[PDB]
Amino acid sequence: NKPNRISPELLATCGYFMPRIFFLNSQYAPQVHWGDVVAALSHFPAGNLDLSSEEFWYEWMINWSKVGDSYINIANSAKSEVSHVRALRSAAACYHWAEFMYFSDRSRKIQLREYIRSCFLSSIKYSDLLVDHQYIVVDKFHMPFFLIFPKGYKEEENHPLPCVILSNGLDSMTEIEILSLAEFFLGKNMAVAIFDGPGQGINLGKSPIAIDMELYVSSIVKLLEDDARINSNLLCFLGISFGGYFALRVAQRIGDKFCCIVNLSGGPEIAEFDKLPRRLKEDFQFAFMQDNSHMQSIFDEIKLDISLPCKTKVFTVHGELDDIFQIDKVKKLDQLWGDNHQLLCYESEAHVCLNKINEYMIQVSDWVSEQFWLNGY
Amino acid sequence: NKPNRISPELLATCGYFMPRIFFLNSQYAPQVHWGDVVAALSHFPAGNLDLSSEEFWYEWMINWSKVGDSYINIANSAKSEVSHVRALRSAAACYHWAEFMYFSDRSRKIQLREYIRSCFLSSIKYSDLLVDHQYIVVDKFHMPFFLIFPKGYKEEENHPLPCVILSNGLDSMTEIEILSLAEFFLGKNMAVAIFDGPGQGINLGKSPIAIDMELYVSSIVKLLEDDARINSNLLCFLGISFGGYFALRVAQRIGDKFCCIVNLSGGPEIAEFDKLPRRLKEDFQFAFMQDNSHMQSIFDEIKLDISLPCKTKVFTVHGELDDIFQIDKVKKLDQLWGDNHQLLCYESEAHVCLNKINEYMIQVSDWVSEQFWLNGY
Ligand code: NA
Numbered sequence: 116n117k118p119n120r121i122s123p124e125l126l127a128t129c130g131y132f133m134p135r136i137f138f139l140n141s142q143y144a145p146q147v148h149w150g151d152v153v154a155a156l157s158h159f160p161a162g163n164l165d166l167s168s169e170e171f172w173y174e175w176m177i178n179w180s181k182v183g184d185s186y187i188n189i190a191n192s193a194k195s196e197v198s199h200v201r202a203l204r205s206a207a208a209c210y211h212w213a214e215f216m217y218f219s220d221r222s223r224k225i226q227l228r229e230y231i232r233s234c235f236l237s238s239i240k241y242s243d244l245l246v247d248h249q250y251i252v253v254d255k256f257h258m259p260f261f262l263i264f265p266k267g268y269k270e271e272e273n274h275p276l277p278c279v280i281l282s283n284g285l286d287s288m289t290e291i292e293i294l295s296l297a298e299f300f301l302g303k304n305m306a307v308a309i310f311d312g313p314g315q316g317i318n319l320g321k322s323p324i325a326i327d328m329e330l331y332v333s334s335i336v337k338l339l340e341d342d343a344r345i346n347s348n349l350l351c352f353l354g355i356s357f358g359g360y361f362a363l364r365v366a367q368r369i370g371d372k373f374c375c376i377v378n379l380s381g382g383p384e385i386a387e388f389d390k391l392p393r394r395l396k397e398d399f400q401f402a403f404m405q406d407n408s409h410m411q412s413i414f415d416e417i418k419l420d421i422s423l424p425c426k427t428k429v430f431t432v433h434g435e436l437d438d439i440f441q442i443d444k445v446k447k448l449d450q451l452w453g454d455n456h457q458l459l460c461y462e463s464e465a466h467v468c469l470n471k472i473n474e475y476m477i478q479v480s481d482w483v484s485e486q487f488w489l490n491g492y
Numbered sequence: 493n494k495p496n497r498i499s500p501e502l503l504a505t506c507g508y509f510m511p512r513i514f515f516l517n518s519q520y521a522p523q524v525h526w527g528d529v530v531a532a533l534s535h536f537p538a539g540n541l542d543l544s545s546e547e548f549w550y551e552w553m554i555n556w557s558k559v560g561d562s563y564i565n566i567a568n569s570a571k572s573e574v575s576h577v578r579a580l581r582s583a584a585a586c587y588h589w590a591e592f593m594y595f596s597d598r599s600r601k602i603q604l605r606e607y608i609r610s611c612f613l614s615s616i617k618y619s620d621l622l623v624d625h626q627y628i629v630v631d632k633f634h635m636p637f638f639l640i641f642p643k644g645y646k647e648e649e650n651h652p653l654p655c656v657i658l659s660n661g662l663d664s665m666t667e668i669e670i671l672s673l674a675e676f677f678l679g680k681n682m683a684v685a686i687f688d689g690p691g692q693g694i695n696l697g698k699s700p701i702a703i704d705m706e707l708y709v710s711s712i713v714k715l716l717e718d719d720a721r722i723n724s725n726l727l728c729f730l731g732i733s734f735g736g737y738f739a740l741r742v743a744q745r746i747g748d749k750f751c752c753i754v755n756l757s758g759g760p761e762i763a764e765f766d767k768l769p770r771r772l773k774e775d776f777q778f779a780f781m782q783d784n785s786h787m788q789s790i791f792d793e794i795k796l797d798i799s800l801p802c803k804t805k806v807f808t809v810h811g812e813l814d815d816i817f818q819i820d821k822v823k824k825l826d827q828l829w830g831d832n833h834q835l836l837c838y839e840s841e842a843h844v845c846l847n848k849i850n851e852y853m854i855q856v857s858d859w860v861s862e863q864f865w866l867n868g869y
């Protein structure tokens with residue numbers, strides 16, 4: 116018998132995704148341990164090493180689902196609330212990596228996201244964080260919304276807090292990657308607003324993702340203006356990935372509502388749809404609830420008019436080797452937007468610079484604090 | 493230009509150590525991100541893949557030192573206390589993986605452990621945990637000692653707390669692996685006592701490790717008896733690795749002082765010294781401050797008399813494929829010690845079962861709580 120280990124071939128093949136799967140060391144956001152990846156991949160079928168193939172991500176979903184199931188069983192037999200919550204968090208992380216690049220069974224993907232959201236709402240019950248969970252009605256759309264306050268927050272012993280609104284990317288889950296980012300702002304005694312817009316979080320596969328996501332952000336701003344606990348003159352919008360694209364839109368359309376905006380590896384336009392690597396064609400197809408033939412036209416419409424003015428301070432983190440949002444288009448935007456746009460460019464980093472996420476989220480969090488201080492906080 | 497990645501050959505070679513390096517998702521204990529491992533190993537010299545070779549661990553120490561240095565620079569330029577502490581923790585983790593299997597420069601290894609301890613004492617200043625740091629005098633030895641209380645602890649609003657004493661293994665650092673384990677008990681509103689006995693933590697390479705570590709544990713017990721904040725009738729001793737060996741000694745010599753004892757992959761005797769794999773000969777040599785020729789005699793003397801009675805409830809977690817503490821010797825002890833010894837044996841797990849550490853620390857923490865409840869807590 117050999118110890119349970121990940122195949123060298125598989126580890127190599129998954130190199131791009133390993134920084135995504137581990138993500139950020141987080142207190143509240145579900146996170147995998149190395150052993151969870153071993154549990155998922157130790158018995159992964161050999162000869163299945165094509166990141167672009169449907170068969171790879173089927174086995175990926177199946178194997179990660181097993182590890183999630185194992186943690187739900189630990190959670191169900193847990194002898195304490197603290198153990199129960201630890202197990203539910205581990206389960207949620209495993210189910211997210213099961214689903215995030217799986218698009219072949221719409222009902223199964225939605226089921227896995229429901230598992231994650233059920234785990235999250237259970238974790239909140241036993242957490243030490245004040246979570247204000249509600250639906251924001253935008254026209255006929257009921258938008259899931261979480262307003263989260265720093266550790267030991269009491270309204271009676273605090274002035275109104277600054278607030279960071281954070282957007283999902285194409286394939287993130289709100290309580291996993293976005294809550295992970297949000298902890299950097301909670302750690303600095305800021306409120307955070309995380310949300311499931313159309314085609315985002317729990318709504319992925321239910322409603323098509325909205326290109327004009329600023330309309331939904333506008334409704335969050337209106338809520339924060341009405342909340343006495345929040346200083347609406349100290350607001351930041353942060354987007355990761357495609358969420359970073361929304362961050363550039365917010366800068367153009369409603370930028371004057373924000374002291375500052377953070378773009379984590381979003382861009383003003385996406386690379387040619389047909390030539391997208393890995394599973395990204397199916398990823399974009401699933402989010403927009405459209406087939407291959409309709410997607411380039413959507414990419415055309417997505418493309419920003421970069422001459423339309425940037426109405427606040429923007430900080431972009433981008434990788435030179437990003438194959439989804441090309442660095443040349445980001446640098447063109449950086450040049451045009453001038454003193455209002457700061458670019459941190461990582462020379463040897465792929466899409467979202469995930470080898471640097473710990474160091475750049477330190478820098479980004481301190482930059483946001485500075486912009487609030489520059490607006491007299 | 494290719495994105496910074498770890499060589500397939502290197503990832504494969506390091507498979508045994510990757511679960512050790514990532515360890516446990518921790519709130520206080522320093523922990524690496526995936527990106528830190530990439531920073532360490534992306535430019536690791538090719539053709540250097542022998543885990544048993546001195547040249548491998550020299551380059552390992554050099555490359556991990558670079559990443560630690562990078563985090564100290566982030567810490568020194570940090571614009572907030574929260575950012576400063578995040579950076580110091582990341583630095584401490586990197587310096588630990590630089591040193592933990594490096595024995596060739598005594599002064600450099602001690603220097604790296606001093607860096608970690610300086611980072612830790614700085615992190616305590618800005619932490620939300622009550623840390624009682626002092627020296628326990630045992631004869632002429634001044635033993636570094638940390639009594640840590642749960643989050644939001646106030647003596648005036650608490651009865652005396654149960655306390656878990658945790659021991660280092662051969663190559664752990666007290667504020668890294670041991671504090672990581674300790675968080676499972678802090679999470680359950682227990683006090684934790686972590687310490688640097690002879691040849692342990694900051695004392696590794698300064699004093700030879702003491703085979704009779706129970707003498708130093710006895711002095712901790714006396715301190716906890718005198719502390720009004722601690723219920724001395726609700727004490728647990730946990731050891732990891734060689735620390736688990738000390739846990740078996742404590743069970744034999746002063747077991748009646750403890751409600752329960754946890755042995756994380758310690759054993760009653762070590763495998764033949766001469767045939768030890770990887771860097772373990774140099775590891776044991778360094779800890780005992782002795783040369784190759786003296787080490788088998790020490791292993792002889794280390795070997796327990798398993799007929800000497802176990803004086804409390806013991807829980808052992810062990811891997812079938814452990815190549816340091818053979819499972820057959822652990823199972824012999826389990827049989828002899830009877831109803832007072834419980835064995836969790838993982839069929840396909842190597843030394844310390846690190847692919848299972850998250851799930852088994854859930855089970856272990858709940859088991860300790862149960863033993864305190866069985867002693868009327
Ligand atoms: Na307000």
Ligand code: NA
Nearest residue numbers: 716717719722
């Ligand atoms: Na006491």
